Nucleic acid binder design. Structure first.
Length: 49
RNA sequence: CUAGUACCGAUUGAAUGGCUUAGUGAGGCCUCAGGAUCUGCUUAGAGUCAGAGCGGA
């Protein structure tokens, strides 16, 4: 069970967990800082136009 | 950060409308004049040959 499943964290509730977004785990894509990240898409869109 | 809501207040920017000072004023109508032209009569041009003179539009 360990070698099959060690990657699984286990949680009480997804809505309450503190899972980090840009997690450093190795299966995360090579591009992260390479990716564009925006936040307020609404306030970006209308501003650009 | 964004949204919403308002005040003044600068340009008169740049316009719309009412009132008002001063000055100007189209057009037709009435009236004082003017007379391009057209035409009747008359002594008189000829057996249309001119001129003048008295009228009308």
């Amino acid at each position: 069970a360990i070698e099959r499943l060690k990657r699984y964290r286990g949680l009480k509730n997804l809505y309450n967990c503190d899972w980090q977004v840009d997690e450093k785990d190795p299966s995360s894509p090579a591009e992260w800082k390479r990716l564009l990240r925006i936040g307020n898409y609404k306030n970006t869109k209308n501003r650009i136009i």
